[PDB]
From TrEMBL, chains A, B:
GO molecular function, one term: N-acylneuraminate-9-phosphate synthase activity
Sequence positions that bind (S)-malate 1: 24, 52, 128
Positions that bind (S)-malate 2: 109, 128
Key word Metal-binding present: yes
Gene: synC
Residues reported to bind phosphoenolpyruvate: 52, 109, 128, 131, 153, 212
Record: residues binding Mn(2+) 2: 214, 235
This protein's name: Capsule biosynthesis protein
Gene3D superfamilies recorded: Aldolase class I, Antifreeze-like/N-acetylneuraminic acid synthase C-terminal domain
Amino acid sequence: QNNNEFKIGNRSVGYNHEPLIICEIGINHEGSLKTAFEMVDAAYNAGAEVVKHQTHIVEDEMSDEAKQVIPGNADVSIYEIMERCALNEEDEIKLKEYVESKGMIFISTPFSRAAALRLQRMDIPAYKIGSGECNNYPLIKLVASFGKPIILSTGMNSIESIKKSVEIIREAGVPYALLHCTNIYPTPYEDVRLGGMNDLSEAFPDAIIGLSDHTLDNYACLGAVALGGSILERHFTDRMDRPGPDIVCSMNPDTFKELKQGAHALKLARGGKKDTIIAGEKPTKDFAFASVVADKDIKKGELLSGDNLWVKRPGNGDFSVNEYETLFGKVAACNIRKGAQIKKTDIE
Amino acid sequence: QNNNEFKIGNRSVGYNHEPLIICEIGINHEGSLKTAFEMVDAAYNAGAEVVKHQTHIVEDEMSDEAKQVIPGNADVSIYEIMERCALNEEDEIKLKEYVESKGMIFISTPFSRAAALRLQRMDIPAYKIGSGECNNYPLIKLVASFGKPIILSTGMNSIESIKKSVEIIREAGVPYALLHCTNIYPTPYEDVRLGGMNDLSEAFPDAIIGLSDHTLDNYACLGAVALGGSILERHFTDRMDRPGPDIVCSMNPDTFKELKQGAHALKLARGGKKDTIIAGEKPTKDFAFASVVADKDIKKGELLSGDNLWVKRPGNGDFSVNEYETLFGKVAACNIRKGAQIKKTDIE
Ligand SMILES: [Mn+2]
Ligand SMILES: [Mn+2]
């Protein structure tokens, strides 16, 4: 598709690089640092390159009205969920060091101004902005002024609303990625609309394109890689029997490994051009292509025609099936045996 | 992508229909009708809709030169392989009835004029033309005059060489499909070039598009579905420990089931548009979007500014984050408490 790219630390991202899978532990640790470490361990052992957290500072993230609104995948207020799962600054700093001590990249999604400022102090290599904040222009202006690349999910937002955020990002001069997304825990296959990735790349040609996903399996993400996706995102848990509203659509070590393997295979198979010559096909072309042969015993002097000529494998004959009709009208320079390949010396 | 379509018997094929998986037993039965039936049974029990055979009449398919050429995946001449695996007319008729007795569709790839005529007598619902015969124009003219839809693989052929075959097909007035393909047993991921499907659809807008595959797994085909493929083809065997040159890249009942499941999921997830409104996202939009709030206690009379205003979740406030800046300059109609959502009655 394109040659756009940028780096998250020492990791290059873009169409011409290996797709990057972001393992979002998010709020899956339910506020326990111990659980968070067990999930970081599972990600590390599964071969993850990036672990993504969610930075929640409830007071700066939402007003009192949030204590009265229930999310689609929960039974209590969003305020109660975030307050229950939120890690204080101290613990989050410990989580970042822990992930890095494992040789992995740590990034986190900020949901507020205070969160963004905390992450800037921690000096993360890139900032993720969720679909909920894709239209929070003032917050995006703040994050872009940090000087690091931005990864923006675009669920729940139209191309036009997104253009305002991208304009702000360009103005700041930092590279960015746009992840197509559908924000429903979980998301049915029918609502995915992988075509959205194309719409985004067409509208924003300088953007790295990817997919953030909330379906129950790897199919959507694998399709995203086939279409040209460079960044894949799925919630991640060490085991499926963990409690939590996001566990339902989370991938686990086993499913992460499958996704990584499939993404690699599709990275290799995607794109390319129809007319490209594949050397490995040579031996097949040599025996599978047809050559012109006598379909009847032809006496010297007789004229060749579509009545006494036909075509058969292999393709080493003097005349290819492509020249079949050009032999019509020619005269046999000698007797031609039925079934024999017509050779140049066979025509006067 | 498009609304092109046609029927293979009572089965509709096209972008707006469920992708069709063709199970190619081909020469996997090694010339044994008993083995062929065991493979047909395995396909049936796995849920296959179509079983594809290969019709070999060695004398009309190749000249004596073929007894001296070895294919890439074999150690003996192509003539010896075909002669060893070929089913006579009697047995092939029995195979067709057997497949149909199982409620499945039977089609077969012809490799010669004699093969095409035999299949016409059997009256198959559609004709498959392999990549080896994609450039065999005289043979294609013969098959097109039969009046049934044609499925043409295009491996080893450039867009220009393919246009000659398509012209012949249109001239005959029958619907057709173009399958991208790479003819190497097996095919590495890197040689797949899924982009070839796009090239084909762009060049031939009236063609149903699909993929014929020879890789070691389902990844290539799943990627093809994500891109818009309507027909998938893989060699098929009842078990992987069967002898034969094509068994290496064949799928088996278990892998067929996985492909069918994935193709279904990707049929649902592919395409669509970014701007489409997903009803299921409503509850998320209501709590995730931000509203304007007082960032400072504002005394009546004071002017609102980016210094004493900010934005926070949820999205039920009188002023959305989109209107943040429009409040700059307004005058507080009364005292505004820090953290409170700015309401219409809050400004004079
Ligand atoms: Mn998510
Ligand atoms: Mn094949």
